[PDB]
Paper text:
Here, we determined the crystal structure of the major periplasmic part of MreC from Escherichia coli at 2.1 Å resolution. The coiled‐coil domain is essential for dimer formation, and the two monomers are prone to relative motion that is related to the small interface of β‐barrel domains. In addition, MreC forms an antiparallel filament‐like structure along the coiled‐coil direction, which is different from the helical array structure in Pseudomonas aeruginosa. Our structure deepens our understanding of polymer formation of MreC.
MreC is a scaffold protein required for cell shape determination through interactions with proteins related to cell wall synthesis. The periplasmic part of MreC contains a coiled‐coil domain and two six‐stranded barrel domains.
Numbering used by the authors:
A (entry chain A): 74 to 273
B (entry chain B): 71 to 296
């Protein structure tokens, strides 16, 4: 079982990153004090496993092994190690269905890490990248830009990675920029996910 | 068969730690923005409260934003909003938990300012947020110069005195109409707003409006801690 130590060393490698995170979180708390703002509070998190995909050919959903008896709620965010995966759309008592962010009925408010541009990112089917709202011609948004949740829908906590801009194209005829972004989370062959609750 | 059981615990541990590290990029930028706002040159008797723009009012005819503070937080109509670099605008409509803010580059926004160099006082009006501010037409014999720094005069009873507003960007004599046309570039960024400070001024209950000299000295004091 080489997998035991492969996991152990990947965990060891996270330490310098985790220490750096600690410093950022402490500084953030100091800054929010000085500016009279309430401190950030950690989310509560719960590991969940994908049982199956919904074999609906027109919707991209998976079933997870947690439900109302575990406190799952409609609209609750779901993430993986690499980023946002989706949200809970239907809760049974032991299981729940999660709509994936690349589903065409899924839309998420996001922000560009680099320069704070805010825009909705909508799914277009999990065969394609996410589609941002059309932006003005002179918008400074770049392939490679990291898109994180803005929280402005009151649904997702602000700051989790969603996607990396993959395409920025000017439509000279119609005078706007067309932007697509590729999710950072793997959205195929899912196993373990995290449900998040904001603190109360 | 605890060996496999241990590796599921390890993978779960790794999932949780990775989910923590996902926040790193956000904290880097967030701490940066908050540290900038901390540079705001406030006076001792002045209170501040950070607030977040939670959207821009979709209107091609008005440059307004919505912020995440309201009457519950002590926000009042006509209250200034600032960045560390300049006046951003003022609260025009207060709800319970949110408020609407008029940016100083909106055509319906004007505020009285004072030239730092020589104490000249004049109204600076917005001309739409694609353009610089417009000073009101002045006599041809006005010594205002490109590069002059404009700060709040407080003459409207709205804005604490001596805070940066703009830098004069164009001075042009229209010899036919016989006045000086002057534009000024706001010193605060007015695009892609995120964090701002709501500002409460010090109480001056019966006090007379500040003299040009007092405003100049307050302005220089603010600029010394920048
Ligand atoms: Cl949201
Ligand atoms: Cl005023």
């Amino acid at each position: 079982e080489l997998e035991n130590r492969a996991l152990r060393q990947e965990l060891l490698l996270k330490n310098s990153e985790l220490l750096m995170l600690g410093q950022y979180k402490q500084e953030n708390a100091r800054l929010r004090e000085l500016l009279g703002s309430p401190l950030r509070q950690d989310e509560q998190k719960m590991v969940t496993q994908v049982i199956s995909t919904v074999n609906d050919p027109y919707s991209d959903q998976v079933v997870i092994d947690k439900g109302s008896v575990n406190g799952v709620y409609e609209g609750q965010p779901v993430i993986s190690d690499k980023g946002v995966v989706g949200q809970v759309v239907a809760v049974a008592k032991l299981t729940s269905r999660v709509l994936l962010i690349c589903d065409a009925t899924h839309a998420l408010p996001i922000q560009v890490l680099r320069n704070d541009i805010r825009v909705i990112a909508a799914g277009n089917g999990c065969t394609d990248d996410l589609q941002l709202e059309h932006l003005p011609a002179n918008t400074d948004i770049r392939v490679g830009d990291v898109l994180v949740t803005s929280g402005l829908g009151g649904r997702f906590p602000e700051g989790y990675p969603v996607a990396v801009v993959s395409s920025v194209k000017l439509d000279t005829q119609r005078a706007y920029t067309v932007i697509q972004a590729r999710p950072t989370a793997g959205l195929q062959r899912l196993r373990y996910l995290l449900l998040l609750w904001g603190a109360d």
